A paper describes a structure:
pmcPhotosystem II (PSII) in oxygenic phototrophs is the multisubunit membrane protein complex that couples light absorption with water oxidation to generate reducing equivalents for carbon fixation. A complete PSII holocomplex is typically found in a dimeric configuration, each monomer comprising about 20 subunits that bind many cofactors. Whereas most oxygenic phototrophs use primarily visible light (VL, 400–700 nm) to drive PSII function, some cyanobacteria have evolved to additionally use lower energy, far-red light (FRL, 700–800 nm) for this purpose. Upon expression of the FaRLiP gene cluster, five subunits of PSII become FRL-specific: the subunits PsbA (i.e., D1), PsbB (i.e., CP47), PsbC (i.e., CP43), PsbD (i.e., D2), and also PsbH, a PSII subunit with a single transmembrane α-helix (FRL-specific isoforms of these subunits are called PsbA3, PsbB2, PsbC2, PsbD3, and PsbH2, respectively).
To gain insight into the molecular structure of the FRL-PSII holocomplex, we have altered the purification procedure of FRL-PSII from Synechococcus 7335 allowing us to isolate a dimeric complex that maintains the PsbH2 subunit, and we solved its cryo-EM structure to a global resolution of 2.6 Å. These subunits were modeled to coordinate 35 Chl molecules, eight carotenoids, 11 diacyl lipids, two pheophytin a molecules, two plastoquinones, two Cl anions, one heme b, one heme c, one non-heme Fe cation, one bicarbonate anion, one OEC, one n-dodecyl β-D-maltoside (β-DM) molecule, and 296 water molecules. Relative to previously determined structures of dimeric cyanobacterial PSII holocomplexes, the structure lacks PsbJ, PsbQ, PsbY, Ycf12, and PsbZ. In the 2.25-Å global resolution structure of apo-FRL-PSII, one site that binds a Chl d molecule at high occupancy was assigned in the ChlD1 position of the electron transfer chain. This is also observed in the dimeric FRL-PSII structure, in which the formyl moiety of Chl d accepts an H-bond from the hydroxyl moiety of the sidechain from PsbA3-Thr155, which is in turn H-bonded to PsbA3-Tyr120. In PsbB2, all three previously assigned sites, 605, 608, and 614, had C2 cone scan signals greater than the null distribution, and all exhibit FRL-specific interactions that confer Chl f–binding specificity. We propose that Chl f–binding affinity is conferred by the protein for site 605 by a CH-O interaction via the Phe sidechain. In the dimeric FRL-PSII structure, PsbH2 is maintained at high occupancy and bicarbonate is bound to the non-heme Fe. The PsbH-Thr sidechain is conserved among PsbH1 sequences, so this interaction is likely identical for VL-PSII complexes of cyanobacteria capable of performing FaRLiP.
Author numbering:
A (entry chain C): 28 to 480
B (entry chain K): 9 to 45
C (entry chain D): 14 to 351
D (entry chain I): 1 to 34
E (entry chain F): 15 to 44
F (entry chain A): 13 to 345
G (entry chain E): 20 to 57, 63 to 72
H (entry chain V): 39 to 169
The structure:
C-alpha cells in the first residue's frame, strides 16, 4: 500500500502527507476524528485540572486558569460580580468533554486502524472533485452557522452571559435586545485597527456581540446552503490549484490571522473577556493605578486639577491630544481604556471633576485597588512585580499567557500557510521536487542585462 | 478543589492534561518500532 | 624507534590523536573538567561575595567558575604557588580554578588549531578551517586574557558561567559603552551577516535543487560519489539577481565570502576588546557631551544612553567589586525620579 | 489636507486594485511548466 | 586497558560521580 | 489586450528587477518608506517622544551624528493611534509628534511582507522550490516584533525600535531593564542561532574553500577555477568530509549535501523565529527567567548569585530610562 | 551488565555519598548553609 | 535564635517563635499579602512600609505581634482616626477581601510574627528594599 516512504514518496517525518492521496481517505477521516478527540481530551482534562486546584479565596485569574474564565463568561457557575456559585458546572463540562473525547477517540481509531481505507458512496471525495469538496465546505459552514445561532439563542434565551457592564459590578443577564442594525454591526468591520478605534476588539456590550453573532449565524447558514447547492463557478477555476495542500494552506492563513485577532481580543477587550475572570488588561490596570493614586490624594487635601508633573503636564489628570480629561503620567497612552468600574467617572469631556471628587461609589475604588496590583507582568517561572524586582510573588496573568501563546500560534501558522501555499503551487505546477536537469527554465529565458541582446 | 464525591482520582487529574503531550511522543515511539520504514 | 610513535599517532581510529593531541587532549580535558568541578562545587563567596555552584543552590544559568579575587592581581595562581602554598582548598577559594581553566583553555585552543592544521596536512586539503578558527582564538585571547591583563586584575575578566557572561555584557555597556564601539559594530555586522549568509545560502541551495530522484523527499537526491552539482547555480543567480539586484555567480567566491564575513567580524570585535583593555573607549562623542551641557534642551538617544550608563555604573559597582568597598548613599545614586 | 487624504485614498486604492485584479488574471498559469 | 577504554572512561568515570553528586544536591536542605 | 500586456509585463521574468503583483505593492511602499526615512533622518525637527514636551533631537541636521541620528518614535501622547499626515492640524505638529516614524513604519512593514511574497513570486516564475521566503520570514518576524508587536503589547509606538543606531542601543538597554531578555530562553536560542550560524557559515565556507579542486595556477585567484554554469562539482565533498570526520569523529560529518544545506538554513532561521517570538511574548510582559533571592542560607539571608548581579545592573538601567515621565513608582507596560 | 553490574552503582553512590556525608564542603572549602553569615572577600595575595 | 524573639505587646514581653511556625507565617505572607506588600513597603501607598521604624512610629505603636493582629482585626490609619476596613483587607470584612476568610487566629499570629522577625536578619534589605 502507501504506508512507507518508497510507495508514497514521503519520509517518516512527513508521513501524514501520505494521507494526502485521494485513495487514502478513510485514514484522513481517522486522523481527523482522533485529533478532535485529543482536542476534547485536553478540553476536559485541563478544565478538571483547573477545578482540582481551585482555591476559592483567590478570585479566578490568580489561579492561572484559562478555561474556568471561558465558562464563567458564559454565565455558567458564576453569578453577581463573578462569584463562583458552584464548582459542579465546571466539573460537568470537564467530564462532558472527556466523554466526547472518548467517543471521538474511538472514531479516530476506527477509521485509522480498522475502518475502510477508501471512502465511498456519498463520502468519497477527491481533492480535484471541486463540487464535492465545496459541498463538504458547505456542510461545515452550515453546521458552524447553526452553532453560532445556537450560542446567540442561549445568550438570548437560556441562562445568559456575564455582562461586565451590567449596573454595578456586573451580573449574568440574558441579552433580550441584540443590535440587529447592519449599520452598527458591519460598521465594526470598517473601524481602523489603530488605537482609539481598535477594529473589532472594541466591541463593548453584549447586544453588539450577540447581534453580530445572529448576523454571522444567518450568513453562514446562507453560505453553507450556497455551497451545497452551487458548485464552484467558472471564474474560480484558474485562481489557484484545486489540490488538498492548497485547501490546507488557505485554512492555515485564515486561522493564523484568526489567532492574531484572538490575541488582540484577549489583550485589549474586557467585555467578551471580563476582567473579573481574566484579570485587568494592561490599559485598565494602568488607569487603575492612576485612579488609586488619585483617591489617595483626596482626603489629604491635594487638589488634583492644579497639580503639575515634572514637565508642566498634569500630575494626575491632564488633557488628551484630542483634548479630553485623561489620567496623567505615562498612562496617557491608555486613555482609550474603558473599564466598567470607571465609566461612572466618565462625563462628557472624559473624567469630569464633578463625579470624580464626590463620586467614587465604594467598590469602584476596591476593584481598581485590585487591578492596580494585579497587572499583566511576569516571567516564565511565574513571578510578578516588574522584572528587576525581588522574587516573592508567584504570578503571571492569564491574558499574558493567552496573548503570548496565540501570537506564537499565529506566527507559526502564518509560516505554515506560506509553506503550504508555496508547496501547493509548486506541486501542481510540476516542479516541487527540484529543477529538471533535462530542461531548466532559466536556461530557456532571455538575459535580464540590458546590454545583452 | 474538585467535588468530594469524586475526590478519589487525585494524581489522575494531574495526569490528564499532559495526556495529549504523550501522543506525539508515542508517534515517534511507533515510528522507531517500525524502524521509520 | 621515533618513527614508530609518529606512525602510531597518525593511525585511523575512532578519534584521531596526532601530535597536536598531546597539547590538546591533556589541556582541554582539564579545562572542561575544571569547569564542571568549579560550577558544581566551589564558591565565589571569598572572591566575589556570591554563590556560583550547584552545591550553593545555583542552577546551570547561575553557576560559574568566577574570576579570581581582586587582590590576587595578575597572579597565575598556580596550585604550588605562594597564594595557595600547595593547599587545594585555599587555591579554590581564591579563584585559582579560573586561572587553571583559562590557561588550559587557551592551550586547548592552540592544540585544536594545531589539530586542524595537522589533519589538513594528513588528508591533503588546504588549511582554511584553521584560518577560520583563528577568529575564536583572537576573541578568546582578547576577552579572557588581554582585557584582564590591561585591567587591574583577573577579577575583571569574564567568569566561566552563563550569568557571569551576562554581568560581563552589562558591565561592558555601563562602564565601557561597548555598543558605541565601532569595532564591536563591525563585529555585530560580521556575525549577523554570517548568520544571514548561512541561512540564505542553505535555503537557496535547498530551493534550487535538481530533480535527481523520484520521491518527494529530496534528501535522497544526492550521492556522495557523484561529481555533479546538486543545485542549479544558474537559477539561483537568476533569482537573486531579479530579487536583490545582485547574486553570486562564482560558487568558490560564495563559499570564500561565507568564510570571510564572520571571521573578519569576529576579528574586528577582538580589536575592540584589545582597545578596551587599556580603557581606550569609544565612550562619548565630545561634540554632543559639550552641546548637551551648554544646552539643557539638546536630547539625543546618545545622551539617554550616557545617562543609562551612569545609572548602571553607580547601581552595580558596590556589589560588583566588593574588594573596593564602594559606599554610595541612597541619595547620590542616580535615580530617574520614580 | 482633505485633498491629500483623497490622493492617498485613491493611490492606495489603485495599487491594491492592481494587486488584486492582477492575481485574478490566471496567475497559476504564469509558471514555466504550462 | 586500551585507547578505546580510556577515551570513554576518563570522560565518564567522573561524569557518573558528578551526576550522583548533583542528584544528591536535589535533596539538600539549606 | 492592454491589460494582458500589463499582466505580462508585471509578471515578466525579463525585467532587470522582477516586479510581480507583490512588487506592484512593494515598490510604492518602499518609495514612501525610503523617501520619508531619508527625509526624516536628515531634516526632521525634534520629536516629543514621551509626550512630556521634551523634544528629542534625532536628525542629522539638528546637531546630530550618523551613529546618534534616528527617526524618533511617535509620541507617547499618541500611543497606538493612527496619526497620518492629514489628521494632524499642520505639518509642524505632525513633525513634532513623531508622525514620520509612523509613516515609515506603516509603509516598511507591508513592504517587507510584499518582499517576502515577491520572493515566492519569482521562485514560482522560475520553476524553483518555493521556500526562500520561509528563510526570509525570520528577519521579517524579528523586525515586526520590534516595530509593531512590542508597541502594540506595551501600548505605544514610542516603545518601538528607534530608527537609528544609538536609538537601537537604547531600545536594547531599556528592554533588558524592563524584561531581562538575557535571561529569556528564546533569546539564548537567538544568540545560539546567530553565533552558531556564524560558526556554521565560517565552517561550511572554510570546508568548501579548503577542499577545492585544482584548476588554476598560484598566481591567479582560486575563484577562476569555477565557471558560471559548469556542471561538474567545484570542490571535493569526500575530502572535506574526511577532514571534518577526522577532526571530531566518524558519524558527525554530513556526508550528504542536501541535508547539509537544509541544516544551514534551519539553524539560524528557526532560532531567529524563536527570538522574534521572545520579543513578542515580552510584548505581553512575559519576561525572562527570574532567579533573584533564590539561594537562601540557613537563617533566610539572600546569598547573592550572578543573576542577582545582573538584576543589580538591570536596576541600574531601570531607574534612569524616561526619567521625567514616571509619576508613579510602577512603570507598567 | 556483568562487569558493570555494581561498577555503575558503586561510582554513582560514591558521588552521592561524597555530597551527602559533607565531604564536598570540606573538599573544596565550600561554605555550609550556615557558614555564610556567622562577608569575607580575601583582601591579600600571599596569605588568603 | 534571638531572631525568633519579637515584641509581643506594648507592655513589653519578647515572645519567641518556632522556626516552623515562622516559616508557615512566611508562606501565608506570600499568598494573601505579597499582592502589594512584597518587599517591605505598600504598593497602594509608598509611605506605609512594614519596617521596624515605621511600625514603632505608628499610632498606636503597631510594632508588636498583638498590635499587628489587632490591626488585622481593624484597619485604621497611621494615627487611627477612621477605621477604614474597606480600603484594606480585614479579618472581619471577608466580603471585600476573601483572602483571610480561611485564616484562623494562628495564621494571623504567624503572619504578624514573621513581619517582625526579619528586620534583624535583613536590615536594609527589607525596610525599603536595597535601594
Ligand atoms: C497597522 C496596525 C497598527 C496598529 C494596530 C493596533 O493598534 O493593534 C491593536 C488593535 C486593537 O486595538 C486596540 O483596541 C482597543 C479596543 O479596546 C477598547 O474596547 C474594549 C472593549 O471591551 C475595552 O473597553 C478596552 O478598554 C477599550 O480600549 C483600544 O482601541 C486600543 O486603543 C487599540 O489599540 O488590534 C486590532 O485592531 C485587531 C487586529 C490585530 C492584528 C492587527 C493587524 C494589523 C492591522 C491589519 C491591517 C488592516 C488592514
Ligand atoms: C594570539 C595567540 C597567542 C598565543 C596564546 C599564548 C597564550 C599564552 C598565555 C600567557 C598568559 C600570561 C599571563 C600571565 C600574567 C601576566 O602577564 O601578569 C602580568 C604581570 C604584571 O603584573 C602587573 O604589573 C603591574 C606593574 C601592577 O603591579 C599590576 O598590579 C600587576 O598585576 O606581568 C607579567 O607577568 C609579564 C608579562 C608582560 C607581558 C604581558 C603582555 C600582555 C599585554 C597586556 C596589556
Ligand atoms: C494527531 C496526531 C496524529 C494522528 C491522529 C495520526 C494518524 C495517522 N497517521 Mg500519523 N504522524 C503523526 C501524527 C498523527 N498521525 C506524527 C506526529 C508523525 C511523525 C512521527 C506521524 C507520522 C506518520 C507516518 C510515517 C504515517 C502516519 C500514518 C497515519 C495513519 C495510520 C496510522 C497507522 O499506520 O496505523 C497503525 C498504528 C498502530 C499504533 C499499529 C493515521 C490516520 C501512516 C499513513 O500515512 O497511512 C497511509 C503512516 O505511514 N503518520
Ligand atoms: C492544521 C495545520 C497543519 C496541517 C494539517 C499540516 C499538515 C501537513 N504538514 Mg505542516 N505546518 C504547519 C501546519 C499544518 N501542517 C505549521 C503551522 C507549520 C510551521 C511550523 C508547518 C510546516 C510544515 C513543514 C516544514 C512540513 C509540513 C508538512 C505537512 C504534511 C505532513 C506532515 C506530517 O507528516 O506530520 C509529521 C510530524 C512530525 C514529524 C512531528 C513534528 C515535530 C515538531 C517539529 C515539534 C513539535 C513542537 C511542539 C510545538 C511542542 C501534512 C499534510 C511536510 C510537507 O511539506 O508534506 C508534503 C513538511 O515538510 N508542514
Ligand atoms: C466528522 C466525523 C465523522 C465522519 C464524517 C464519519 C463518517 C463515516 N463513518 Mg464514522 N465515527 C465517528 C466520526 C465520523 N464518521 C465517531 C466520532 C465515531 C465513534 C462513535 C464513529 C464510528 C464509526 C463506525 C463504527 C462506523 C463509522 C462509519 C462511517 C462511514 C459511514 C458511511 C455512511 O453513510 O454513514 C462514514 C464515511 C462506518 C464505516 O466504517 O463504513 C463502512 C462504520 O461502521 N463510524
Ligand atoms: C468560511 C466560509 C467560506 C469559505 C471558505 C468560502 C469559499 C469559497 N467561496 Mg464562498 N461564501 C460564503 C462563505 C465561504 N466561502 C458565504 C458565507 C457566502 C454568502 C452567504 C458565500 C458566497 C459565495 C459566492 C457567490 C461564491 C463563493 C465562492 C467561493 C469559492 C472561491 C472564493 C474565492 O476564492 O474568492 C476570494 C474572495 C473574494 C472574491 C471576496 C473578496 C475578499 C478580498 C479579496 C479580501 C471558495 C470555495 C465562489 C464559488 O466558487 O461559488 C461556489 C463564488 O462564486 N462564495
Ligand atoms: C501600495 C501603495 C500604498 C499603500 C498600501 C499605502 C498605505 C498607507 N498609506 Mg500611503 N502613499 C503612497 C502609497 C501607498 N500607501 C504613495 C505612492 C504616496 C506618495 C504619493 C503615499 C503617501 C502617504 C502619506 C502622506 C500618508 C500615507 C499614509 C498611508 C497609511 C494610511 C493611509 C490610508 O488609510 O489609506 C487607505 C486606503 C483607502 C482609504 C482607499 C496606509 C497604511 C498615511 C500614514 O502613513 O499614516 C501614518 C499618510 O499620512 N501615504
Ligand atoms: C519535544 C519534541 C519531541 C518530538 C517532536 C520532534 C522534535 C525533534 C526534531 C524534529 C522531529 C522530526 C525530525 C525532522 C528532521 C528531518 O528528518 O529533517 C531534516 C532532514 C531529513 O533528511 C533525511 O533524513 C533521513 C533520516 S535522518 O534525518 O538523517 O536521521 C535520511 O534517511 C534521509 O536520507 C534524509 O534526506 O535532513 C536532516 O537530517 C538535517 C537535520 C538538521 C535539522 C535540525 C536543525 C535544527 C537547528 C535549528 C533548530 C533550533 C532548535 C530550537
Ligand atoms: C494578609 C495580608 C496583609 C497584611 C498582614 C497587611 C498588613 C498591613 C499593615 C500592618 C499595614 C499598616 C502598616 C503601616 O502603615 O505602618 C498595612 C498598610 C497598607 N496595606 Fe497591607 N496588608 C495585607 C494585605 C494588603 C494588600 C493585599 C494590599 C493591596 C492592595 C495592601 C495595601 C496596603 C496599603 C495601601 C496600606 C497603607 C494604607 C494606610 O496607610 O492605611 N495590604 N498593611
Ligand atoms: C460576530 C461578532 C461581530 C460580527 C462580525 C462580522 C459581522 C463579520 C464578518 C465578516 C466577513 C463577512 C468577512 C470576511 C472575510 C474575507 C475573507 C476571509 C477573504 C478573502 C480572500 C482572499 C484571501 C482571497 C485571496 C485570493 C486572492 C486575492 C488572490 C487570488 C486567489 C484568491 C482568490 C485566493 C462583531 C465584531 C460585529 C461583534 C462581536 C462578534
Ligand atoms: C508606475 C507604477 C509602478 C511604480 C510605482 C512606483 C515606483 C511607486 C512609487 C512611489 C513613490 C516614490 C512614492 C513616494 C513618496 C513619498 C512621500 C509621501 C514623501 C514624503 C514626505 C514627507 C512627509 C517629508 C516630511 C518632512 C520630514 C520628515 C523632515 C523634514 C520636514 C518635512 C516636512 C519635509 C509599478 C511598476 C509598481 C506598477 C504600478 C504602476
Ligand atoms: Cl504613569
Ligand atoms: Cl532612556
Amino acid at each position: 500500500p502507501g504506508y512507507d516512504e518508497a510507495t508514497s514518496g514521503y519520509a517518516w517525518w512527513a508521513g501524514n502527507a501520505r494521507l494526502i492521496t485521494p485513495e487514502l481517505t478513510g485514514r484522513f477521516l481517522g486522523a481527523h476524528v482522533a485529533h478532535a478527540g485529543l482536542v476534547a481530551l485536553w478540553a476536559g482534562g485541563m478544565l478538571l485540572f483547573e477545578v482540582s486546584h481551585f482555591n476559592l479565596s483567590k478570585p479566578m485569574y490568580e489561579q492561572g486558569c484559562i478555561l474556568m474564565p471561558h465558562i464563567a463568561t458564559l454565565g455558567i457557575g458564576v453569578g453577581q460580580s463573578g462569584e463562583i456559585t458552584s464548582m459542579f458546572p465546571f466539573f460537568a463540562i470537564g467530564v462532558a468533554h472527556l466523554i466526547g473525547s472518548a467517543v471521538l477517540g474511538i472514531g479516530g481509531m476506527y477509521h485509522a486502524i480498522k475502518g475502510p481505507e477508501k471512502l465511498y458512496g456519498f463520502f468519497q471525495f477527491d481533492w480535484t472533485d471541486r463540487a464535492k469538496v465545496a459541498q463538504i465546505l458547505g456542510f461545515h459552514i452550515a453546521i458552524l452557522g447553526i452553532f453560532a445561532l445556537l450560542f446567540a439563542a442561549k445568550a438570548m434565551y437560556w441562562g445568559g452571559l456575564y455582562d461586565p457592564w451590567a449596573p454595578g459590578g456586573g451580573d449574568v443577564r440574558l441579552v433580550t435586545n441584540p443590535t440587529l442594525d447592519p449599520r452598527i454591526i458591519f460598521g465594526y468591520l470598517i473601524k481602523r485597527p489603530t488605537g482609539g478605534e481598535g477594529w473589532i476588539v472594541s466591541v463593548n456590550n453584549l447586544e453588539d456581540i450577540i447581534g453580530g453573532h445572529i448576523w454571522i449565524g444567518c450568513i453562514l447558514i446562507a453560505g453553507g446552503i450556497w455551497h451545497i447547492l452551487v458548485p464552484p463557478l467558472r471564474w474560480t477555476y484558474n485562481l489557484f490549484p484545486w489540490t488538498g495542500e492548497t485547501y490546507l494552506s488557505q485554512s492555515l492563513g485564515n486561522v493564523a490571522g484568526q489567532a492574531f485577532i484572538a490575541a488582540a481580543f484577549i489583550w485589549f477587550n474586557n467585555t467578551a473577556y471580563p476582567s473579573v475572570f481574566y484579570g485587568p488588561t494592561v490599559p485598565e490596570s494602568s488607569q487603575a493605578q492612576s485612579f488609586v493614586f488619585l483617591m489617595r490624594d483626596q482626603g489629604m487635601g491635594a487638589d488634583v486639577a492644579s497639580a503639575q508633573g515634572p514637565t508642566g503636564l498634569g500630575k494626575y489628570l491632564q488633557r488628551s491630544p484630542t483634548g479630553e480629561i485623561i489620567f496623567g503620567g505615562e498612562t496617557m497612552r491608555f486613555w482609550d481604556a474603558r473599564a466598567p468600574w470607571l465609566e461612572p467617572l466618565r462625563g462628557k469631556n472624559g473624567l469630569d471633576l464633578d463625579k470624580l471628587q464626590h463620586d467614587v461609589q465604594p467598590w469602584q475604588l476596591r476593584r481598581a485597588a485590585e487591578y492596580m496590583t494585579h497587572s499583566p507582568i511576569g516571567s516564565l517561572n511565574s513571578v510578578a512585580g516588574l522584572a528587576t524586582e525581588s522574587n516573592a510573588f508567584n504570578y503571571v496573568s492569564p491574558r499574558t499567557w493567552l496573548a503570548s501563546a496565540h501570537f506564537i500560534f499565529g506566527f507559526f501558522f502564518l509560516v505554515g500557510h506560506l509553506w503550504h501555499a508555496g508547496r501547493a503551487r509548486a506541486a501542481a505546477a510540476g516542479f516541487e521536487t527540484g529543477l529538471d536537469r533535462e530542461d531548466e527554465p532559466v536556461l530557456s529565458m532571455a538575459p535580464i542585462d540590458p546590454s545583452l541582446r | 478543589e474538585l467535588p468530594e464525591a469524586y475526590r478519589a482520582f487525585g494524581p489522575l487529574i494531574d495526569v490528564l492534561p499532559i495526556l495529549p503531550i504523550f501522543f506525539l511522543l508515542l508517534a515517534f515511539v511507533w515510528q522507531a518500532s517500525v524502524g521509520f520504514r | 624507534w621515533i618513527k614508530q610513535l609518529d606512525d602510531w599517532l597518525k593511525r585511523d581510529r575512532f578519534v584521531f590523536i596526532g601530535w597536536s593531541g598531546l597539547l590538546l587532549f591533556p589541556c582541554s580535558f582539564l579545562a572542561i573538567g575544571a569547569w564542571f568541578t568549579g560550577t558544581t562545587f566551589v564558591t565565589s563567596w571569598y572572591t566575589h561575595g556570591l554563590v556560583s555552584s550547584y552545591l550553593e543552590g545555583c542552577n546551570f544559568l547561575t553557576v560559574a567558575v568566577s574570576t579570581p579575587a581582586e587582590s590576587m592581581g595578575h597572579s597565575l595562581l598556580l596550585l604550588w604557588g605562594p597564594e595557595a602554598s600547595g593547599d587545594f582548598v585555599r587555591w579554590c577559594q581564591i579563584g585559582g580554578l579560573w586561572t587553571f581553566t583559562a590557561l588550559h583553555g587557551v592551550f586547548g585552543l592552540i592544540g585544536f588549531m594545531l589539530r586542524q592544521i595537522e589533519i589538513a596536512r594528513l588528508v591533503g586539503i588546504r588549511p582554511y578551517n584553521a584560518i577560520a578558527f583563528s577568529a575564536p582564538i583572537a576573541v578568546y585571547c582578547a576577552t579572557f586574557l588581554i582585557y584582564p591583563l590591561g585591567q587591574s586584575s583577573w577579577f575583571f575578566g569574564p567568569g566561566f558561567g552563563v550569568s557571569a557572561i551576562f554581568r560581563f555584557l552589562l558591565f561592558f555597556q555601563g562602564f565601557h559603552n561597548y555598543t558605541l564601539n565601532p569595532f564591536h559594530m563591525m563585529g555585530v555586522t560580521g556575525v549577523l551577516g554570517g548568520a544571514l549568509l548561512c541561512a540564505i545560502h542553505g535555503a537557496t541551495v535547498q530551493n534550487t535543487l535538481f530533480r535527481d530522484n523520484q520521491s518527494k523527499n529530496t534528501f535522497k537526491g544526492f550521492s556522495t560519489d557523484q561529481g555533479e552539482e546538486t543545485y542549479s547555480m544558474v537559477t539561483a543567480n537568476r533569482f537573486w539577481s531579479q530579487i536583490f539586484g545582485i547574486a553570486f555567480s562564482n560558487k568558490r567566491w560564495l563559499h570564500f565570502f561565507m568564510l570571510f564575513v564572520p571571521v573578519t567580524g569576529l576579528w574586528m570585535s577582538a580589536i575592540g576588546m584589545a582597545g578596551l583593555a587599556f580603557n581606550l573607549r569609544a565612550y562619548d562623542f565630545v561634540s554632543q557631551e559639550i552641546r548637551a551641557a551648554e544646552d539643557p534642551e539638546f536630547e539625543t538617544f546618545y545622551t539617554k544612553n550616557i545617562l543609562l550608563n551612569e545609572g548602571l555604573r553607580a547601581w552595580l559597582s558596590e556589589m560588583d567589586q566588593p574588594a573596593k568597598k564602594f559606599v554610595f548613599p541612597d541619595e547620590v545614586l542616580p535615580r530617574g525620579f520614580s | 489636507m482633505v485633498t491629500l487624504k483623497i490622493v492617498v485614498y485613491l493611490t492606495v486604492s489603485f495599487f491594491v486594485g492592481l494587486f488584486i485584479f492582477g492575481f485574478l488574471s490566471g496567475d497559476p498559469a504564469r509558471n514555466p511548466s504550462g | 586497558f586500551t585507547i578505546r577504554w580510556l577515551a570513554i572512561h576518563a570522560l565518564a568515570i567522573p561524569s557518573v560521580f558528578f551526576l550522583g553528586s548533583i542528584a544528591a544536591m536535589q535533596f539538600i536542605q539549606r | 489586450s492592454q491589460w494582458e500586456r500589463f499582466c505580462q509585463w508585471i509578471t515578466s521574468t525579463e525585467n532587470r528587477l522582477y516586479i510581480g503583483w507583490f512588487g506592484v505593492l512593494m515598490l510604492p511602499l518602499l518609495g514612501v518608506s525610503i523617501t520619508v526615512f531619508v527625509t526624516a533622518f536628515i531634516a526632521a525637527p525634534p520629536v516629543d517622544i514621551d509626550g512630556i514636551r521634551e523634544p528629542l533631537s534625532g536628525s542629522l541636521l539638528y546637531g546630530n551624528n550618523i551613529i546618534t541620528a534616528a527617526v524618533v518614535p511617535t509620541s507617547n501622547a499618541i500611543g497606538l493611534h493612527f496619526y497620518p499626515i492629514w489628521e494632524a492640524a499642520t505639518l509642524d505638529e505632525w513633525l513634532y509628534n513623531g508622525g514620520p516614524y509612523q509613516m515609515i513604519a506603516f509603509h516598511y512593514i507591508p513592504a517587507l511582507l510584499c518582499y517576502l511574497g515577491r520572493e515566492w513570486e519569482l521562485s514560482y516564475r522560475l520553476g524553483m522550490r518555493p521556500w526562500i521566503c520561509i528563510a526570509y520570514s525570520a528577519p521579517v518576524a524579528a523586525t515586526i516584533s520590534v516595530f509593531l508587536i512590542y508597541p502594540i503589547g506595551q501600548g505605544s509606538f514610542s516603545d518601538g525600535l528607534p530608527m537609528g543606531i544609538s536609538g537601537t542601543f537604547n531600545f536594547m538597554f531599556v528592554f533588558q531593564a524592563e524584561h531581562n531578555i538575557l535571561m529569556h530562553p528564546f533569546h539564548m536560542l537567538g544568540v545560539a542561532g546567530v553565533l552558531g550560524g556564524s560558526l556554521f557559515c565560517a565552517m561550511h565556507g572554510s570546508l568548501v574553500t579548503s577542499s577545492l579542486v585544482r584548476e588554476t595556477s598560484d598566481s591567479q585567484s582560486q575563484n577562476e577555477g569555477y565557471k558560471f554554469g559548469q556542471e561538474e562539482e567545484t570542490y571535493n565533498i569526500l575530502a572535506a568530509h574526511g577532514y571534518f570526520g577526522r577532526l571530531i569523529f566518524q558519524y558527525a560529518s554530513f556526508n550528504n549535501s542536501r541535508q547539509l544545506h537544509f541544516f544551514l538554513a534551519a539553524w539560524p532561521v528557526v532560532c531567529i523565529w524563536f527570538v522574534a517570538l521572545g520579543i513578542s511574548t515580552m510584548a505581553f510582559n512575559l519576561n525572562g527567567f527570574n532567579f533573584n533571592h533564590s539561594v537562601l542560607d540557613s537563617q533566610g539571608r539572600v546569598l547573592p548569585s550572578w543573576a542577582d548581579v545582573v538584576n543589580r545592573a538591570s536596576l541600574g538601567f531601570e531607574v534612569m530610562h524616561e526619567r521625567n515621565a514616571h509619576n508613579f513608582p510602577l512603570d507598567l507596560a | 551488565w556483568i562487569i558493570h553490574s555494581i561498577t555503575i552503582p558503586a561510582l554513582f553512590i560514591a558521588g552521592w555519598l561524597f555530597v551527602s556525608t559533607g565531604l564536598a564542603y570540606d573538599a573544596f572549602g565550600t561554605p555550609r548553609p550556615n557558614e555564610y553569615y556567622p562577608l569575607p572577600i580575601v583582601d591579600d595575595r600571599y596569605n588568603p | 535564635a534571638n531572631l525568633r524573639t519579637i515584641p509581643l505587646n506594648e507592655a513589653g514581653d519578647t515572645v519567641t517563635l518556632s522556626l516552623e511556625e515562622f516559616t508557615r507565617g512566611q508562606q501565608k505572607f506570600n499568598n494573601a499579602c505579597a499582592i502589594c506588600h512584597l518587599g517591605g513597603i505598600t504598593k497602594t501607598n509608598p509611605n506605609v512600609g512594614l519596617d521596624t521604624e515605621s511600625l514603632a512610629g505608628a499610632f498606636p505603636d503597631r510594632n508588636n505581634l498583638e498590635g499587628l493582629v489587632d490591626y488585622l482585626h481593624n484597619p485604621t490609619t497611621y494615627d487611627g482616626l477612621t477605621e477604614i476596613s474597606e480600603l484594606h483587607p480585614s479579618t472581619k470584612s471577608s466580603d471585600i477581601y476573601p483572602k483571610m476568610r480561611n485564616l484562623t487566629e494562628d495564621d494571623l499570629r504567624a503572619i504578624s510574627g514573621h513581619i517582625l522577625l526579619m528586620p534583624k536578619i535583613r536590615g536594609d534589605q527589607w525596610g525599603a528594599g536595597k535601594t
